[PDB]
């Protein structure tokens, strides 16, 4: 029922790059999803205490959220685009795992994922 430490956003010994694909992931992908009317439940790690989800972290062992991804992109945490794309996919997958089909939160994730897929389709060449 307690919250775990949040995912890492800082790791000085992790090698880093700033690439045109990672720039696109921030300037286009993250910004598009962040501004959406359904963004709010995904803009920070799941607070299992505030949201009264005492089993959330029993079930979800690889937590991820756009607050974390936003910090990772702004602080150049990544080496490549695939790492960041995996974070988004983890976020959506977690939501579908924990929740019931048709739940509001699932519909919200689906709308963000649709946009995500549209933006990744046009990921610029390296």
Residue 118: HSE in the Cβ half-sphere, 13 Å Cα cutoff: 9
Tell the CATH topology of 19-123. Answer: Histone Acetyltransferase; Chain A (1.20.920)
Query: Over the range 70-79, which residues count as b (16 or more CB within 10 Å of their CB) and which as e?
Result: bbbbeeebbe
Our CA angle for 88, 71, 91, nearest 5°, is 20
Solved how? X-ray
What residue ranges do the domains of the chain occupy?
Answer: 19-123
11 CA to centre of own chain: 18
Contact 77, 30 (CB under 8 A): no
DSSP state of 37: T
Between helices 104-121 and 81-98, what is the axis angle to 10°?
160
With 0-12 / 13-18 / 19 or more C-beta atoms within 10 angstroms meaning exposed / middle / buried, residue 67 is middle
Reduce the DSSP state of residue 78 to 3 states and report it.
coil
Place of tokens 């936003």: 70
Q: Residues 6 or more apart from 104 whose CB is under 8 A from it?
A: none
Resolution in A: 1.5
């Amino acid at each position: 029922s307690m919250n775990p430490p949040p995912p890492e956003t800082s790791n000085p010994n992790k090698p880093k790059r700033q690439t045109n694909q990672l720039q696109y992931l921030l300037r286009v992908v993250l910004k598009t999803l962040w501004k959406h009317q359904f963004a709010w439940p995904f803009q920070q790690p799941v607070d299992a205490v505030k949201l009264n989800l005492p089993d959330y972290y029993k079930i979800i062992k690889t937590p991820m959220d756009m607050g974390t991804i936003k910090k990772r992109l702004e602080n150049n945490y990544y080496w490549n685009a695939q790492e960041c794309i995996q974070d988004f996919n983890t976020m959506f997958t977690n939501c579908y795992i924990y929740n019931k089909p048709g739940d509001d939160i699932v519909l919200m994730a689906e709308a963000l994922e649709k946009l995500f897929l549209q933006k990744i389709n046009e990921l610029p060449t390296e």
